[PDB]
Design a protein around this ligand. Structure first.
Ligand SMILES: CCOP(=O)(OCC)Oc1ccc(OC)cc1
Ligand SMILES: [Co+2]
Ligand SMILES: [Fe+2]
Length: 328
């Protein structure tokens, strides 16, 4: 009955199945894939890599990914539709703004940003008719003045459409608390919101405080670890020095504290990555050759072997994303 928009059109919520709620086909910048496709070898090479990766995920049981690339992450919805079709994996596209908005966005009011998010949800992205099914926002510490506007615009767009909001945080700085305060100031329900990158911290006081208020807690960087690459400063800064098992333990922790229905799990993976240092994709591909199959192949069995019931693991990977993505 309930439906969600994907880059291939509407699908029943019940067909979303096992869903990775924070992912990227390509982490880039607005206009960049059009201006400089050779950065990625070629657009064709990038697509082929993405198709191989999504087929691998699919083989491991993933049926849907939420590509949370916004305009300023250089989201290319035609690319998403091409790879979704070829790999037979659903892709939900995003509106919103990450932390690299250009001046044409940064100069905008809350009202104007709301119109833009609404356009991408209700009308379509660019000239494609593909509708966003999620709204992505970001802070990296205390919100900038502009980021405050973005979070308010995200709340308003969500209220008008029922589409959920998902966030990038600096989890070590506990951004989720201010994000929550801003969302609530606009009257947005916490159940419409996922506070992302929350597995970047082991601060369970912070995480359970959010979960208790009804927020979804995005444990979405599972394979991120620069353990063994301490010589690579850019890898250390991005990936951290905590193991995937450490990250995965937070899923169990929240389940053990009663919060199984408030957890979303993902990788924050990608198949191309131009917004960071050159060759970062090769480093990442070495850290996690499994890509977006890492959660089903490593994390879910790890949790099972720690005694998490199959029903609970299905609730986390199927029921929670379905409830979150269903327009409400
Ligand atoms: C690794 C994925 O997370 P990120 O927010 O990218 C979204 C596509 O990563 C960053 C990208 C650029 C940065 O510049 C300082 C920092 C993080
Ligand atoms: Co992010
Ligand atoms: Fe991301």
């Amino acid at each position: 009955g309930d439906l969600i928009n994907t880059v291939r059109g509407p699908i029943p919520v019940s067909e979303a199945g096992f869903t990775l709620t924070h992912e990227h086909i390509c982490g880039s910048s607005a206009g960049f894939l059009r201006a400089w496709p050779e950065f990625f070898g070629s657009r064709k090479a990038l697509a082929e890599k993405a198709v191989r990766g999504l087929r691998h995920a699919r083989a491991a049981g993933v049926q849907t990914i939420v590509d949370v690339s916004t305009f300023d992450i250089g989201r290319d919805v035609r690319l998403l539709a091409e790879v979704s079709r070829a790999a037979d994996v659903h892709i939900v596209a995003a509106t919103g703004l990450w932390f690299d908005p250009p001046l044409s966005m940064r100069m905008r009011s809350v009202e104007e940003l709301t119109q833009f998010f609404l356009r991408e949800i209700q009308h379509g992205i660019e000239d494609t008719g593909i509708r966003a099914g999620i709204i992505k926002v970001a802070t990296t510490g205390k919100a900038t003045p502009f980021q405050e506007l973005v979070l308010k615009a995200a709340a308003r767009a969500s209220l008008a459409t029922g589409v959920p909001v998902t966030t990038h945080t600096s989890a070590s700085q506990r951004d989720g608390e201010q994000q929550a305060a801003i969302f609530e100031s606009e009257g947005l329900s916490p159940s419409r919101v996922c506070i992302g990158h929350s597995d970047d911290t082991d601060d369970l006081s912070y995480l359970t405080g959010l979960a208790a208020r009804g927020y979804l807690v995005g444990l979405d960087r599972m394979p991120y670890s620069a353990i063994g690459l301490e010589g690579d400063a850019s890898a250390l800064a991005l990936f951290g020095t905590r193991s995937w098992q450490t990250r995965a333990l937070l899923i169990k922790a929240l389940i053990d504290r009663g919060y199984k229905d408030r957890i979303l799990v993902s990788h924050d993976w990608l198949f191309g990555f131009s917004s960071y240092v050159t060759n970062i994709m090769d480093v990442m591909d070495r850290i996690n050759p499994d890509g977006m199959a890492f959660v089903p192949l490593r994390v879910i069995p790890f949790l099972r072997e720690k005694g998490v019931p199959p029903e609970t693991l299905a609730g986390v990977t199927v029921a929670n994303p379905a409830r979150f993505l269903s327009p409400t």
